[PDB]
Each structure stands twice: as structure tokens, then as C-alpha cells.
Amino acid sequence: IANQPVVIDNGSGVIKAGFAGDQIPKYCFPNYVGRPKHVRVMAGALEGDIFIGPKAEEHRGLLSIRYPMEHGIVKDWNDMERIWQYVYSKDQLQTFSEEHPVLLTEAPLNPRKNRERAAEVFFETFNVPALFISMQAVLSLYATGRTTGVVLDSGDGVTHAVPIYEGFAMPHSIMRIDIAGRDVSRFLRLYLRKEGYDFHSSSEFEIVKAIKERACYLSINPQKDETLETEKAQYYLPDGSTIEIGPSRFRAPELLFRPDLIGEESEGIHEVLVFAIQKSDMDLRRTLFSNIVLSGGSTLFKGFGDRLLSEVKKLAPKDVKIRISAPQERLYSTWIGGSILASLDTFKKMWVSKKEYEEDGARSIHRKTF
Amino acid sequence: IANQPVVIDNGSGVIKAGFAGDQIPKYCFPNYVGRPKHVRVMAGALEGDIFIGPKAEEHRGLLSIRYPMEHGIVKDWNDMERIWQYVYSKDQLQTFSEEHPVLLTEAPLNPRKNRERAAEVFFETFNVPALFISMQAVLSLYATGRTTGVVLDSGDGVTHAVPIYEGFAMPHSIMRIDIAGRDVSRFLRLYLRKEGYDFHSSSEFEIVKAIKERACYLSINPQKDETLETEKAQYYLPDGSTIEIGPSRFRAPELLFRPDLIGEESEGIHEVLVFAIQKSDMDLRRTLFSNIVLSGGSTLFKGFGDRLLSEVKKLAPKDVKIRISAPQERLYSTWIGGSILASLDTFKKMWVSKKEYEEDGARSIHRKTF
Amino acid sequence: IANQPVVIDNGSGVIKAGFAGDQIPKYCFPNYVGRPKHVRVMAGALEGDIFIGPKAEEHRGLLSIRYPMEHGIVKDWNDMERIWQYVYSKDQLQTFSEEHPVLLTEAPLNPRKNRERAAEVFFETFNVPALFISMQAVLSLYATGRTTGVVLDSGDGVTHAVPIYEGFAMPHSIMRIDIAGRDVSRFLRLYLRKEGYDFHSSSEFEIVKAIKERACYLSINPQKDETLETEKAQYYLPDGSTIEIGPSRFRAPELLFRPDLIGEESEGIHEVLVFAIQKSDMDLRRTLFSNIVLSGGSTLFKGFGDRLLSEVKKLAPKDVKIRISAPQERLYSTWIGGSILASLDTFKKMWVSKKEYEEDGARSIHRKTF
Amino acid sequence: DPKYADLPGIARNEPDVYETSDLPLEELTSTSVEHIIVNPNAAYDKFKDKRV
Ligand SMILES: Nc1ncnc2c1ncn2[C@@H]1O[C@H](COP(=O)(O)OP(=O)(O)O)[C@@H](O)[C@H]1O
């Protein structure tokens, strides 16, 4: 039993899912569980106590948002189960959890328990015929045509760099920091508090995200705009208020390039990529510097390509050609790659059957992790 | 040439003052502005149209009290000019602002406009020779004489925690919520309105504050005590009547540990302390859980720290010694520490001189924030 | 001038110092320069702002940690100068760096620039009258009183093996691989990130080192335990928390015997010893296999010698008597032997005086070092 | 309380500090290594006059 496998991009910021073979993900709703805050008095009000996706995006003010997944690691399994049930619901897919194979992506270097419990959910609550867990790097290469490259994705929760050369991944060169879009939004919130605009509710946190996506850019230099103390561009709120920002629409996204601002010694996104390339073999440097792929929604900031180029250019050895392929589907690259992989027939050999898991368990998943 | 500096300790509800090198803040008065409500008719009435200080308390029923500093952010600069002039008036200090340095105190994570406008006030209206805006946690550590500690203060309008280990502050583990004494007073006003007592007048809010400061305690088990219909203790008035408070004398201070009662989703005071410690390093947690120092006015409720110990035990890891050290000078700890800080020798170089402000401007005070 | 010489025993992870004649190195401290991360506020806090020694161990969390010597090669000369000054400071030796000859130690096959610059430091900054750089194998042999025997040591950064037959060092029979305890700690951190316990801070890495030094054992059967299930023994962090290590507690020290886990074509410690013996003559292999003196820090794992005898018997020819001796204080073997050697009478001719360095320079060091 | 009685809100009748209950290598002994005693004095007595 199988017909058009269900590709699921289990991303901590937005979950993208659809069937295999689909050129575009049909359902991309955010990854949060919306529960109400205000008591229902009037009969005939909204129904249910769990709002997911399109409903929890229109009635946002009424809700309190609880992100299930944080930094690519599930916290409340109940919430993820409900989101997956929402995916198979009538408003999203109208399918059963027993008639289609499931390709669910995962960030690299996640703990084993995520793989175990994810398969337990998909094999116990859902009676999925076939489950395959992948990497969120290979899929971007699939959806971009290339087979050799450095996948530098920056989702909403975890950024990493995976150097893949001619279809071979070099796992020891994988660098991974847990500082992405969430931290940028949260740090933007702290900058608004320093600029006098507080936000504390969970429903207003998405307004901070809205500010980030609609008004944040990246300066090519960290000090040519720092002491300049530029203009204060206004930005309207959903009610009709007014927010002028100034030194936060560029100071907040520099958290990716230097996480010392958040008070955490780590490496910046540029050091993540450069260290992932330098940890690889001596002969493979030029091909990895000329094949850099971007993915993830955090790689959509204005001036992000120029900053990434200049930082790598400072860290790479002289005269090495640095090409950064930046497709227009950075949000859906991993999903499109999933739709490609599940549309092949080698995927049939790559998944895990139900009886395979029943006779073995978690061991079968760690066996076919790559 | 320099003189004995003035420690103008701010506050959202009470503004303390006094010269450096002292041991008791000799001039304390509430931070509110009172102007007459009624019509002056007789010849020989009170004169001034603005009453600040003990005179305002002497004629509460004649003045429309209004606080100009809400949640640590100055909302009325003109009223603050009047208040600071009253500090330098012939009733509290009898000195000139041109002959003394100022040690102003601010809550952490305040908007930059407060610091900049405070600079313009103390350097354009008052021709102060030198100003130094400091924090409030460090000052309480100076007052207690310690070097390490988690200062958990709770002013009239801002509760915050700043973990400091061996004289080093961690600017990323600072929690700050705008839910404190004034908001608990407003919540108690709401419960007295639910019990059958009106207190809609702003001058009557002081009576509500007196009720809070005199007949309110923190129950250890909240709902277990809520089910038991207490004796309904009777409290007097500045009128001579009698009010039966009842159950609204223990669940009114529960707002500090449960911000859900005000309908605002945020953390509790215990969660502020625990999260401020957990957001710090790993090797710095036993010492921070040990040295827990309280401050602020709102930490004077009956059984405050006892419930704090219970909640901290519910959140701290197992078998860790906790010492909530609450001195008897919790109200004036920040002023005592300001006297100790300004009475040192390095304070001469800690401030910002008037010439420095004339040269740079706001940039100078922004550089010396800590 | 020839006073009690100073026997400085370098180490990539734990330095060892002390005068010549002491049976135990009285002044031992880790080899890392710690400097604070957080902003200092309270005047009268810790001073110097560059912590080296026990102060760096007492306030680990407060400061950042960066090692100046990696794989026996000094990467930052400024930090090593500060460390050597700390060795001569008021907290370790309280003596002048000019009234004593210095006996330094180095791992074999190190680059010549380290020897050059190290003697440049000890003869230019410190005005030492005589320096004598030497290996570690010879010193451990002076400590054990023997004159023969292959010396195998697994320090924090260098795992080498130098065979000596009655005082005749065979330079071409020396095997050295840079796969040691620091890399085992790093591989352990990688497995913990694969567990969920993601330690990532620099000052947090010492906790991983403590876990390695405490809850780690080497199973005799490699794949039998490497593929089965664990028991998940719990461990207490300094936070007061609890960590379930599990399967990584035995797979983390396996790196020493098979560097394929980290992705590096090299040899295990057993292959290092076997090849270092086999590279010698044919009339010495019996005496070398019958005399193996272990030393070095990482040769303290539970179940280490067992696996060495198993691997060596699989590699060495049959019916060959294999013995493995080791000293009691394995961590201070080389230093003790250095104290013995420096306390002799031939040491007057063994060193390199200051006038010798002024005449020739680096060439004299390279000549008299062998 | 020498100078801490004059202030209006200094709280008393409550304890100051709120505490909680104050309550309280093997490879050297293995079998595959013939562990040796170092004894630096004996080694110095051995290498006392062996000149170079
Ligand atoms: N146009 C944009 N510009 C900048 N950032 C964006 C934009 N659109 C989305 N983002 C950020 O990127 C995130 C997109 O999530 P994504 O990168 O897909 O996370 P994941 O890969 O885990 O699904 C959003 O949460 C938001 O933080």
C-alpha cells in the first residue's frame, strides 16, 4: 500500500508538506499550536481548543502561541502530533495515515531520541506504511540540480553547513550552531525594548517576526552604519500604530554573523561555512568554494549575499573563486528536493517498512540514517 | 574643584534622595505630582498649583495625584522637571544643581530616550557638573557589602533580576517584567471593587496602596487558602469607616507570582529569578542560587521569601542550598549603595563630565552605561 | 651561577613545574589562559582580567577559555609567555627567572620553530642562564630508574612512542600521532550533542573533560560492546543536574585505538607502539616487547591496558613475551625524571648557557638538543 | 539597629535570611600492567655518578 508519498519538511519555523511529485509544496502553514486565552461566553463562537495554520493566523490576537519544536528538537510531542494530524486532516490533505509513504526531513546532528520518537509517532499513532528520515542538505542539492556543494541553510531554528561532494557527504565536516531566525526575532524584540516598544505576548511575537521579514536588512559593513545613526524608517503595525526603528533593522540580523551579541561564544554563520569547508579534504577546497548553496528562510535578508561573500572572501585564501548559488526557492528548496527524492524508485529501497520497525525498532532508523 | 555628590535615586513610586557619604536617605518622598481638583475661592488658600512632597500627602483629598514615571519609563518630562527641582528645592536639599554631581539610578533595559532626555535635563536645565547613571542591582550589592549575588528587586513598577558573580554583571541574563507594586495596587483596587467598595478616585489610590502595604500577606499554598473562607479582617480608613477585605488580601499579592491574573502572559517573580540564573553559565549556578539578594519595596510582604523559597525549590535542581538574603534595608538598599558608590574615589572617573557632554552628547552617556 | 634548577614540564593540557629535587611537582595547574566574558561593573571585583591558574579553575564559568598549545605545538606565544611568567609568579615559585637553569620538556618530532621560539623566549624575556630542552621518554626512563624500554605516552595533545635501548635513542623509530585526550574530549562532546546534552561553551568544555576523566571506560571487546545496548548510568553536573550518558561513555575513548571515528586516516595507539618497535632492528624487538613503560595522561582509562595487550598480541608475532609496566604517579612521571636528570652532575654539560645562545643562537639549540 | 529605626518602612519581626535544609583512578589497580614504584631517591642513587 502506497500512492504518492507524503513529503514533510518538519521545520521548526514553518512546516511545509505535500505529496511526492508535486513541483511546489501545497501547504505551508506555520509550526505552532494556538490555544485561546479568553473565555468563551457567547454560544456559536469559534469551535475547538486547538488552532493550527490558517485559522491560527487570522485569529492570532485571540491566541497564545506555543512553538512545539525549538532548535530542531521537539519539546511537546502532543503538539507535533496535533500538527501532523492537521496535515492529514480534511482541510489539508484528506488522506489517511496508512496509504502513503512519508518522507520527513530533519536537521543534522539531532539527538537520537528525536529520530526514535518521530518514528514512534509515525508508526504507532499513524500507521504509516513507509517512513524515511533524511538530511536537510541533500534535498537542497536535489532541488538545485547540483551534486557537489556546501549547503548552508538557516532555518528558523538551526543553521548548519554540510559539504557534499559528488553525492558523498563528509559527515565530520558538518558544523552546526543553534542560532537562527528565532534568535534574530527575539533579539529584535530586545532591540525594540531598548527603543521603547515592548512585546511580551506570544501572539505579538509574530508581529516581531513580521517586522523582521518586512524591514530588516544587513549592512555590508558593521561600522559604516553603526556610528552613522541613520534615519528612522517608520513601519505600520496591524492595528494602525506606528513604529520607527533606525538602529535595529540592521543591528538585529548581525546576530547571525556574530553571536557574541547574544552572549554566547560560538561561530558566526560565515565561520560555520568556512570551518565546514576547511575541515574537509585539501583537494576539495576550490570545488566547495565555488559551489555554495543557500537555503532556509533566514538567508533572505537584504544584503545577505553580499555580506556572506565578503566574509568568506576574508576567510578564504587569496584569489580563490567563491560562487554562492542562491536560488529563489530558499524556503521550499528542501521540500522540492523531498518531492524529487520521494518521486524516485530508489526511495522504495531507502525507506523502512512497518514490520522492519516492529522487528527491530530504533536500530533500523539509525541504520538507514544516511 | 568638586563637592559632595547628590544621590538622586529614582523610583517608579518613591524617589529617594540624600548626599553621598551618608547612611540614611534623609529626604524621601513619593514620586507623584498633585494639583488641585476643586476651585480656589477664599483668599489665603494654598498656593502653587503643583504640590510634590509631604505637602501632597497632607492634602491628598484636594489634589489629583498622577504618577509621571510608569514602569520605569518617564512618561511626563515636565512633571519630572518639577520633581527634580523639588529635590533641589528649599525643602529637601537647599542646594544648587550647579555645585554637585548627580548619581541617578535607572532600571535595566530601559529605552535609550530616557537616558538621553535625562542627560538633557540634568545638563541643560540643571547645570550639573557631572552625571553618572547607574544600575540598581549593583547598588544593592554595594549596600550589602557583597561581591556576588542575584539581585531580585521589585520596585513599584518594575521587577527584575540581574545575576552578578564576583562583581561581574551578565548583561544577557537580565530578566525584566513590568508587573510590580503599582500594578498589584491596581489589581487590589479591582478586587475591592469586586467586593463592594469603590476607589475610582486617583487620590484614593493612595488609600489602596496603604491597604496593600498594611494588610496583605502571601499565602504559601494559594488555592488551598482560597477555598478556606477566612475571618475577613477589618481595616480602618483615613476617613474613619471600616472595610472588610476578606479573601482579597492574599490573592491580590499573588499577581507577582502569577501574572495571569492581570490577563498578561509573562513570567512570575520566581520564574524571573530562576530564569535569570538558568540563562547564565553552568559553572556559575550554585553560587548564584546561594547568594540570592532581595531589594525593592514589593519584597516586604508577609511570607514573601518563604513562598519564594518554595517556588525556587520547585524550579531549582535537587539538593542545592538557597539563601534568600533579605536585609531590613530593602527599601533603601539602592540609595545606601549609591552613597557607597559615590563616596568612593574611582567615582571621580566613573561619571561623565559636563565638558564631555558638551563635546559628544548622548554618545558619552551611552558609552558609560555600566 | 648554578642554583637549584627549575624543571618546567610543559603539557598541552596540564602544565607541571617545580624545582629539581622535589619528589612530587608541587605546582601543577592546567594549561589555559582564561579571560572574562561578561562586563565588569562593581568596582573592587577581580583584577588582572587575565586569569591563569587556580583562579581560572575556581571561576571557570565567569571566563572564556582558550588553550595556547595544541598538539604539542605552541599556537599563541603571548599566552605562553604569560603562563611561564605565572610559573615564576608569586603563586607558584616566588623566584626570579635568572637565578635558575631551566629544564623544559617537549614532545618529539615537533616543529623546529617551537624549539627556536621557545628558547628565544627563555633567553630573551626571561634571562635564564641555561636552558636544556629535552624529550619526555628519556625523562620517564630516568624516573623509573631503567635504561631500556619503549616509552609510550598519551598526553593531552600528543600520543607518541619513543624506544630506547640502554640509553640509545632511535630517532627513526619514533611514531607520533596527534590524536589524544583533548581530541577524545572533543569527540565526547560530539557524542553528547548526539545525545541531547549539548555542551558548547568554552568554559563548559571543562565539564566534558571532567566527564571524560571520570565516567569513561574502554571495553575490551570493541564491536561486541560497540553494537549492543548500554545501561545509561547517571552523572551529576556541577549545576546539580543529572545526565544520562549511556553508550557514548565507551565509544568516546575508542578514538585512541581507531582514528577512523573522527575521520582521519592514522593509527591507533597500539599500532603506534607496534610500528615503533618494528621499525627498529631485529635483535631488539624481544627486549622492547618485554619492556613497555606507559606514561601520559590518557593512559588512565578503565580497561585500557587490557585492550592494549589484546591489540598488541594480535599484532606482535606469536610466542613473544609482552610486558607492560607503568609508574604509580603516571601523571608526574616525566617531571620526576626531569627532576632526577636536572639534579645530576652531567647537567652542567647537558644545558646550553646564555653565552652559547648569544654566540650561535638557534643553531646551538638544534645542536645540543640531540 | 543604630541608624535603621528612623526610616518609616524597615520591616521587622521576620528573619533576614531564608535558607533551606543544609545537608551533606581504577586503572592503577588493574591487572594488565605491572605497576612500578617510582622512588626518585633510588633512581638518583643509581644515576649518581654515571657521567656523560
Ligand atoms: N522574506 C524574508 N526575509 C527574511 N527572513 C525571512 C523571510 N521570510 C521568512 N523569514 C525567516 O525565516 C524563517 C523561515 O523558516 P525556515 O527558514 O523555513 O525554517 P525551517 O527551515 O526550519 O522551516 C521564518 O521563520 C522567518 O524567521
Ligand SMILES: Nc1ncnc2c1ncn2[C@@H]1O[C@H](COP(=O)(O)OP(=O)(O)O)[C@@H](O)[C@H]1O
Ligand atoms: N511595607 C511594605 N509592604 C509591602 N509593600 C510595600 C511596602 N512598602 C512599599 N511597598 C511597595 O513598594 C513600592 C515602593 O517600592 P520602591 O522600592 O520605592 O520602588 P522604586 O524604588 O522602584 O520606586 C510601593 O509602591 C509599595 O507598593
Ligand SMILES: Nc1ncnc2c1ncn2[C@@H]1O[C@H](COP(=O)(O)OP(=O)(O)O)[C@@H](O)[C@H]1O
Ligand atoms: N581518569 C582519567 N581518565 C582518562 N583520562 C584522564 C584521566 N585523568 C586525566 N586524564 C587525561 O590526562 C590528560 C593530561 O595529560 P598530561 O599529563 O597533561 O599530558 P602532557 O603533560 O603531555 O600534556 C588530560 O587531557 C586528561 O584528558
